DNA sequence: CGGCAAATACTG
DNA sequence: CAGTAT
DNA sequence: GCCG
């Protein structure tokens, strides 16, 4: 399936085009569509030839195959050389942290073109201007190497200071990707307490060797802080910013929260919406029956949090046969 | 046609 | 609450 | 966008 070579690559790097154009413009769900088939193709054991061989998978239909028969036949989609070219400096606007369709779009409305304007002449959040400071190396993925790198750096980190610590890297990096956009590390302790207010002696001790550069998430003041989304940068020469997230949790969700750190998104979404048909509920926290809803049908109590001692226990539950990382792309 | 890829954590 | 982020 |  998914941990394979993509047979039409050529057809997919268009569609992509498409996917995100329509994305920033705010059509989120006619994006989802070109994603979902775009996936499709990218697991299709073999190359894409004729338009009945695409209407023969799911998540293709006659619009889209319409679409993979001019590529095939003339190595060009014709739709692509009619995009607003107000989509480039959309997707050039979002693609900075804390800026979104609606601040990208805001932006635009506003005059804007470049990252030179809105670096001198846009209202920035204390996020978007860190965003924007390593706009371009926040652009760059990183070798699984890095990666592996920075994640020895914030365990190592913690251990330091309580070796019963464990510290596992989620995210892309678990699917076995060759790349990660970031690196997702995942904290917690056996003894179920011992992960507890922790954030303060490991984030301190980061920015102390100098690890950690700047802080785009984190309420440190309060003591049940879960997230951190930070920048790091490993030492030496030629070494680029790297988008780190930290979370810590009770072993007790351990199993839930591997799972949803894991990822991928999709698979997420995708997954917790099948709980939610048969009368669960599925987060980083734990797998629950349906809540409890007086008469008029308002959330009054909690479900009964099933036993997800590891994420085996969940599939099983959920009624569906376990997935490796790798195959949880989508 | 309307639903579809969710549940949750921070910031003004 | 709206927006952005996992 | 595709699908029930
Ligand atoms: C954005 C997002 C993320 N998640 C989860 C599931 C994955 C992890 C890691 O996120 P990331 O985007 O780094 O993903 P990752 O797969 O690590 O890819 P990168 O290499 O970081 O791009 O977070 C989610 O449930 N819903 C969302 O909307
Ligand atoms: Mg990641």
Redesign the pocket.
Known sequence: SQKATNHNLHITEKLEV?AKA?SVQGDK??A??????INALKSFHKPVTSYQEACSI????????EKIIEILESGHLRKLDHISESVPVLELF?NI????????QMWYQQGFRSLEDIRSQASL???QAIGLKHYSDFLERMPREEATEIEQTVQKAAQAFNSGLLCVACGSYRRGKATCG?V?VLITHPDGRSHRGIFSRLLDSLRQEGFLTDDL???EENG????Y?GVCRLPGPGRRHR?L?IIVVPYSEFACALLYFTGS??F???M??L??TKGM?????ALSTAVVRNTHGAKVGPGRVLPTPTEKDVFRLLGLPYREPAERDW
């Open positions: 498409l329509y769900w006619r989802a569509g070109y994603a979902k088939a799911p998540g293709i239909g006659k619009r889209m195959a979002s942290w804390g800026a979104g369709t609606k601040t990208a959040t204390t996020q970031d997702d998430v984190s309420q049940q802080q879960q997230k989304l988008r997230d998104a999709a997420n979404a995708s917790r919406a709980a939610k509920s599925l987060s980083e926290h």
